[PDB]
């Protein structure tokens, strides 16, 4: 990918870049999933051994406070601001807010809201005054790459994201193990109740939670499952990684072309009865200028 920016890249030291990041040593892990209920079109399989070079990865998704500092320093205008609208979950649109008649096929719970963007996540009249440490949302893949580049970083590949999110466990269902609520404790912010009609908020949140909510995984990463979907570097496909080759098994970058970029980790909207996509092997995609109230990102870096 060759992005275009209207801000200069500032000089930063290795110590500055590594703050808030964990060092993932080089090595192998078992990527992918073979849950019999996985949707074939998602390409969770095959399970395969992947070798990665050492890398750094953020413990936390990028926060509102951090994104605000980037915008302050650069004047960056997000894709949602250029388009003038972004996707908001229906239950979060305040009555009377102007909304477009737009229909996401098969997903009527998404509302295209004029003026929804990172600083006004439910549209005009909303703000982030009480969410400085929540993940920034309404950021597209382009916005994420712009932030990461300004920060001296990059987006993780899907393999890097998944190795870090798995937190040293071999082929567990979730970042922390195989039970969704071990010892009856919520470990991530997803949906409880009847999707898309009623979220009971049993885990504490019916929207985003602070980036440091819940226990971390074994590598010290927070909210890799749930909270917000997280953009990765790779172009999406369902089958590129079915090939057995060095390109797909050593520092894999994904296919060289595509139409949508990978997103990992699930969000506050995920539920077993509909998508079941908060398992660590799960994966989906979105087109790179798209944005939504449940999608953000975390950065990676070469050491």
């Amino acid at each position: 990918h060759m992005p275009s920016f209207d801000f200069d890249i500032p000089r930063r030291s290795p110590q500055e870049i590594a703050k808030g990041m964990v060092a993932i040593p080089g090595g192998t892990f078992r990527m992918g999933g073979e849950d019999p209920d996985a949707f074939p079109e998602d390409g969770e399989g095959p399970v395969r051994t992947v070798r990665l070079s050492p890398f750094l990865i953020d413990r936390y998704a990028v926060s509102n406070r951090q994104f605000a500092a980037f915008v302050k320093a650069t004047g960056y205008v997000t894709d949602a601001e250029r388009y003038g609208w972004s996707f908001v979950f229906h239950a979060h649109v305040a009555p009377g807010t102007p909304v477009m008649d737009a229909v996401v096929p098969e997903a009527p719970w998404w509302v295209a809201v004029p003026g929804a963007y990172w600083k006004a996540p439910e549209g005009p009249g909303s703000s982030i005054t009480d969410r400085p440490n929540h993940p920034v949302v309404h950021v597209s893949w382009n916005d994420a790459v712009a932030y990461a580049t300004w920060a001296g970083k990059r987006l993780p590949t899907e393999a890097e994201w998944e190795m870090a999110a798995r937190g040293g466990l071999d082929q567990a269902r979730y970042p922390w193990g195989n039970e969704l609520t071990p010892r009856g404790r919520h470990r991530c912010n997803i949906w409880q109740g009847t999707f898309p009609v009623h979220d009971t908020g049993e885990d504490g949140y019916t929207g985003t939670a602070p980036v440091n909510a819940f226990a971390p995984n074994g590598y010290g990463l927070y909210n890799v499952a749930g909270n917000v979907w997280e953009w990765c570097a790779d172009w999406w496909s369902a089958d590129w990684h079915a090939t057995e080759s060095p390109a797909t098994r050593i520092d894999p970058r994904g296919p060289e072309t595509g139409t949508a970029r990978v997103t990992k980790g699930g969000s506050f909207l995920c539920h077993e009865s509909y998508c079941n996509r908060y398992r660590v092997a799960a994966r989906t995609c979105n087109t790179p200028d798209s944005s939504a109230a449940h999608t953000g990102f975390r950065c990676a870096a070469d050491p």
């Binding site: 979907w229 997103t263 699930g266 798209s290």
Partner: peptide
């Protein structure tokens, strides 16, 4: 009925 949708795209509403 078809694959569940978690990523709503700007292209999808056209």
């Amino acid at each position: 009925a078809t694959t569940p949708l978690c990523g709503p795209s700007r292209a999808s509403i056209l």
